[PDB]
Design a protein around this ligand. Structure first.
Ligand code: ATV
Ligand code: ATV
Ligand code: MN
Lengths: 95, 87, 106, 96, 96, 82, 106, 95
DNA sequence: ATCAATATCCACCTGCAGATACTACCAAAAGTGTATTTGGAAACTGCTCCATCAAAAGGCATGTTCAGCTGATTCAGCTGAACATGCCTTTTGATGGAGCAGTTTCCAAATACACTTTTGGTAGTATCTGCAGGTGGATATTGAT
DNA sequence: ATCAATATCCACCTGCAGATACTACCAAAAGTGTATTTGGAAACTGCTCCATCAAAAGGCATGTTCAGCTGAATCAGCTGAACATGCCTTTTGATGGAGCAGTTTCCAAATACACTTTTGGTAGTATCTGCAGGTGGATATTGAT
C-alpha cells in the first residue's frame, strides 16, 4: 500500500511563515505540489544539459546556479541566486 | 460484459450555450453563427492529439485504464502542462 | 543528529531533494551543495507564490487559499506569469479583462 | 415588458464568467466525446474519472485562450464579431 | 523617360529574395549590434566568427517569419501595407 | 558622422527581409518597430549564450553557446554544431 | 568478428549509438536491442531527407546537395515540415510563396 | 588535436545508397549532422521519460519504439517502426 | 491595338573554392570472452475504483422579433514606391598575439557501504471551522421617454 | 432629467464537508561513520583563430514626384442577441466485479571487467571538378500611347 510522497508539509510550513492565519485547500496544495515538481524538473533539466555540454559528470551547486539564471526571469532569478548561495554558505559553515 | 452501446456524434453535445460561455470567459462580446462548428472542429483536433498521446502511455504501461498521469504526461508533451492532477 | 535542512536553515527537505536528483538520472555524480542550493530556490519560489496568493485570498474576504488565488497571483505578477506562461492551473479561471472597443457608449 | 439592448447581457456574461472558475461544458456530454475519440484509437479502455477531468480542464483552458486570441483578431479587423477567419488566423500565427 | 508602377518592383524583389538564401543585412553593422548588446551582460568579450554567424542566421530566419505572420495580419485587416499593429498582434498571439 | 548601432540595421536591409517574407507594401513606421523587436530577440538570445560562456569560464562566446541558447529559446538552429 | 551495424544490416553505427546512450544519463541500464532500433530509425530518416533533397538537387540542375536543397525538401513535405516545424536550417531561405491578393489585376 | 566525432560518413554512405551520383557540401553535411543529433536527443529524451514514468531501470527497444510513435508524424512514424523492427530481427537472427 | 524600355532567359565559357582522394598511422572506441549482478515478467491474489445502474433537479432547443453590425460604395487626401543623384561605410585581405584547448598533477570531495536513528506517510477514529448557498431586503444599472 | 423594471449588492444565517487534530505505528527513509576511488581545479603552454588595421570595393542616404492605398463617411440588408416558452438529459448518490497494483520468485539479460582488433578521425598532401559568375543575343513583361 505504497507511500505517495509530496511536498505538502513543507509547503504548509512556508505557508505559516508568510501568512500565519491563512490556510490552503487541497486542490490548491495539489497545484503547489505540481509547481514544485515542475520547477525541480526544469532546474535539474537545465543542470543536466549544462554538465553534459561541459563534459562534467557532476552536478554541483554551481551547475544549479546557472540553471536558475537560465530558467527564471530577472528578479526571481537574482533573488533565488542569493537565497541558494546563502544556504550553501550556511551549510558549509555548519561542518 | 454484454453490449457496449455505440458512441457516435458526441461532438454535438458541445452545445451552442457551452461554446458561448467559453467565448464569454475569453471576453468575446459577439459571435458569428459559424463559430460553433469551427470550434467543435478545433476542439476535436485538440482532443485527438491529447488522447492519442495519453493512450500511447497507457498501452506502454500495459494497462486498460487511461490515468490522469497518462493525460498529464500527454499534456506536457504538447506544451500544455497542467497543474492540479498529480502533474 | 541534525538535518542538512536545519544545517542550511531551510524548511524544505535537503535529504529528499538530494535523493530525487540521484533517481532522476541527471548526471553520474551529484555534489553535496547542489540539493542544498536547489531546495533553497524551491523554497524561495513557493514562498513568493504563497505571499501573493495569500493577498488574493485576503482581497476576496477569504481565509483559505484556493486555486483561483494562485491564478490571481501568478497572472498578476509579470515574472511569475512568464515562469508559468505555458502552464495551466486547473480551476483558476482568467483575469477579468474586457477589451476597450467592446464597452458601450463613448 | 423591459428589454436589454443587444450587447448588454453579453457584457453581463463576460463579467460573470471572467469572475468564476467552474467548467462550462456539461460533464457527461464531454465525457462521451472523450470516450468516443478514445475508442477510435483503441477498444476496451477505461478512464480514471480524474483523467476525464484533467482533459476537460485543459480543453476549456485551451479554448478560452483561443477565444482571447480570436477576439483580438476580430478587433484587428475593426469588427466586434468573431468569425471562423479570426480563429484560423489565430491558429496560423500560433503555428497550429 | 520610362517608369515602373508602384508595387511592380516590390513583387520583383519578392521573387528575387524568395529565390536566394543570402543574409540580407550587412555583416559588420550586425557584428557591432551583437557586440554592443553583449557588453551589457559581460565585458571584454570576444566572439567566434561562426557564433556571430549563428546569431545572424537565427535572427534573419526569425525576422523573415515574423514578416510572414505580420503580412497575414495586414491582409486580415483588409490592407496590403504592413504596420506596427500587425507586428504587435503577431507577437502577442505568438506569446512574445 | 556618428551613429547608433541599432540604426546600422538599415531601412534597405529591413525592406529586403520583409521581401523574403512576401511583404509588398511597408508603412514608414515598420523600420523602428523592427529594430525594436530585433533588439529584444538579440537580448534574449545573447543573455543566454553568454550565461553559457561564463559557466565555461571563457572570455569568448562560441557558436555552441549560441546554438544552445537558440535551443532553449525554442529556436533550434541547424548548421553550427551540436 | 563482425560489427553490430553489419549484423543489423545498417550503415549507421550501432556501436556509437549505444555508447552515446550510456553516456547520456537517459537510464541506468540500456538493453542490447535499443541502440539497434534507434540507429535504424536514424538511418531511415536520414535516407528520406537525403532522398528528397536529392530530388530537389535534380530539379534545380544540380548534382551536389546544399542547404537550400534541404530546406525545399523539408518545407515541401507536410511531415518532415511538422517534425522540423521549430527548426531553422541555416542558409536555407524560404519557399517561393506570394499571397494572392498581392497580385496585380490581370 | 582531440577528435571531433560526427555522423558525417554514415550520412555519406546513405547518400550514395539513395543517390549515388549526388554529392553534398560541408554546410549541407553539417545540417544533416545537427538533424541526426537532434532527433537522437528527442527520441532518447522521450524514451528516458517513458522508462521513469513506469519506474524501470532500462531503456529497451520497446521504449525507443513508443518514443518514436510519440515524436514522429503518422507516415514517418510507421516506417521508422518497420525499419526498426527489421534491424532488431536481423540482429537477433544472427550469430 | 504598336512601340520601346527594360527585365529575364538560355547556352555556353571557365577558374578555383570546395570537395574528393589517400595513407601514414595511430589512439581510442568497438568487439569478444567469463565472471557476477540484478531487473523485471509470471504467477498469485488483496482490494480500490471503475462502470453501471435508478431518481430528481436543472439548462437546452426553438421561434419570434428587431437593434445595430458588417461590408459595400464612394472618394479625397497623405503616404509610401520608384528612381534620379553622387557619396562614405563595409568588405576583403594580411599578421602579431590572446586565449582556448591539450596535458599532468594530486587532493578534496565524491561513491561505496554497514549499522543506527529519525521522519512522513496513513490509517484509524477525532471534534473543529470556512464558506457555500440560502434568505430578504436595501441599492445600482439600464433603457423608455 | 424622470421613472421603473431588473440586476446587483451585501450583510446576516444554519449545514456541512472538507480541513485540521492525534494517537499509534513503521517502513523507509535519512543521518552517521570510516573505508577507497577519483573528478576536476589548478598550473603551465602550444598554436589556432580572433581583433585589428589597411586597400579596394560597392550600396545606402536624400530629395523629388505622384500613383494608388488607407480610412472616413454613408448606408441598407440582414445576421445575431434577447427572451418566452416547452420540456428532456444531466447530475448525483448507491452497490457488485474488473483490473491494477502489491507482493515474491528467479532466470534471462545486463553489467563489469579485461584483453584483442579495428575504424574512423586527422592531416599531410596531393588531386580533381561543379558550378558561379561571367559572356551575348534572343524573347518576354511591362507600360506608355
Ligand atoms: O423546472 C425545471 C424543469 C422542468 C421540466 C423539464 C426541465 C428540463 C430541463 C431543465 C429544467 C426543467 C430546469 O432547469 N428546471 C428549473 C428548476 C428550478 O430548478
Ligand atoms: O563609386 C562608389 C562610391 C564612391 C564614393 C562613395 C561611395 C559610398 C558608398 C558606396 C559607393 C561609393 C559605391 O558603391 N560606389 C560604386 C563603385 C563602382 O564600384
Ligand atoms: Mn467510433
Amino acid at each position: 500500500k505504497t507511500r505517495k510522497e509530496s511536498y505538502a508539509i513543507y509547503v504548509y510550513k512556508v505557508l505559516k511563515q508568510v501568512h500565519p492565519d491563512t490556510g490552503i485547500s487541497s486542490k490548491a496544495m495539489s497545484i503547489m505540489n505540481s509547481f514544485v515538481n515542475d520547477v525541480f524538473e526544469r532546474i535539474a533539466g537545465e543542470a543536466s544539459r549544462l554538465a553534459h555540454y561541459n563534459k562534467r559528470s557532476t552536478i554541483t551547486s554551481r551547475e544549479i546556479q546557472t540553471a536558475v539564471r537560465l530558467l527564471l526571469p530577472g528578479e526571481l532569478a537574482k533573488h533565488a541566486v542569493s537565497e541558494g548561495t546563502k544556504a550553501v554558505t550556511k551549510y558549509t559553515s555548519a561542518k | 460484459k454484454r453490449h457496449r452501446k455505440v458512441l457516435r456524434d458526441n461532438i454535438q453535445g458541445i452545445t451552442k450555450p457551452a461554446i458561448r460561455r467559453l467565448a464569454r470567459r475569453g471576453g468575446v462580446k459577439r459571435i458569428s453563427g459559424l463559430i460553433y462548428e469551427e470550434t467543435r472542429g478545433v476542439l476535436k483536433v485538440f482532443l485527438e492529439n491529447v488522447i492519442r498521446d495519453a493512450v500511447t502511455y497507457t498501452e506502454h504501461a500495459k494497462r486498460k485504464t487511461v490515468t490522469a498521469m497518462d493525460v498529464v504526461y500527454a499534456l506536457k508533451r504538447q506544451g500544455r502542462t497542467l497543474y492540479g492532477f498529480g502533474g | 543528529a541534525k538535518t542538512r535542512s536545519s544545517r542550511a536553515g531551510l524548511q524544505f527537505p535537503v535529504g529528499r531533494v538530494h535523493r530525487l536528483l540521484r533517481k532522476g538520472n541527471y548526471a553520474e555524480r551529484v555534489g553535496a551543495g547542489a540539493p542544498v542550493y536547489l531546495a533553497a530556490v524551491l523554497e524561495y519560489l513557493t514562498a513568493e507564490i504563497l505571499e501573493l496568493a495569500g493577498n488574493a485570498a485576503r482581497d476576496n474576504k477569504k481565509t483559505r487559499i484556493i486555486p483561483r488565488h494562485l491564478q490571481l497571483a501568478v497572472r498578476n505578477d509579470e515574472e511569475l506569469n512568464k515562469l508559468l506562461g505555458r502552464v495551466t492551473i486547473a480551476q483558476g479561471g482568467v483575469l477579468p479583462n474586457i477589451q476597450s472597443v467592446l464597452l458601450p457608449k463613448k | 415588458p423591459h428589454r436589454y439592448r443587444p450587447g448588454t447581457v453579453a457584457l453581463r456574461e463576460i463579467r460573470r464568467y471572467q469572475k468564476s472558475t467552474e467548467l462550462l461544458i456539461r460533464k457527461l456530454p464531454f465525457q462521451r466525446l472523450v470516450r468516443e475519440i478514445a475508442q477510435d484509437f483503441k477498444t476496451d479502455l477505461r478512464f480514471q474519472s480524474s483523467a476525464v477531468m484533467a482533459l476537460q480542464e485543459a480543453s476549456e483552458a485551451y479554448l478560452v485562450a483561443l477565444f482571447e486570441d480570436t477576439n483580438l483578431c476580430a478587433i484587428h479587423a475593426k469588427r466586434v464579431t468573431i468569425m471562423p477567419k479570426d480563429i484560423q488566423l489565430a491558429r496560423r500565427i500560433r503555428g497550429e
